[PDB]
Symmetry: C2
Subunit: 97 residues, 2 copies
């Protein structure tokens, strides 16, 4: 199992990237803030999550999202060592604007 | 929205912590490895995710998990700046041993 669903505001201008051999991607940073419940207590949760969306099929989304967009993203997480930097690979995104 | 579900192997010995004013916690590191699908391609996903489980109610789980346990955890993520270090606050855990 590997599934993250996270909402937030895009806080960095999205970067469009195209690979010569197909497979283009769009990367951005999603800032999440919420109140969560833990052991009976209500505490603040905050994160700035790198997000990537790949594939020709998804090329449209990039030109419809920008900094300040309210967005909910669902995908898998993957990490690489710097602790290790986390990226959310988005399978789906929903807009709230 | 803020929900992560992630399976893996506990790769660091769990640390039991009790606060004097109630609210005890148990922290550990969960190593995830899987094949995920992205833009048609099958690629490896890997992460070493800090996990915390809080509350008197959950005090038992700690003495039933150890390094090498296969485990699936579901909760919310929260981050703090070092990029920012991520922690999974577990609302529920399921064992696979």
């Amino acid at each position: 199992t590997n599934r993250l669903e996270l909402s937030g505001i895009i806080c960095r201008t999205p970067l469009r990237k195209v690979s010569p051999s197909g497979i283009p991607h769009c990367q951005f940073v999603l800032e999440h803030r919420s109140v969560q419940e833990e052991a009976g207590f209500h505490r603040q949760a905050w994160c700035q999550m790198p997000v990537i969306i790949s594939g020709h099929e998804n090329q449209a989304i990039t030109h419809s999202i920008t900094v300040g967009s309210a967005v909910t993203v669902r995908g898998f997480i993957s990490c690489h060592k710097a602790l290790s930097k986390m990226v959310l690979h988005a399978e789906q995104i929903e807009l709230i604007d």
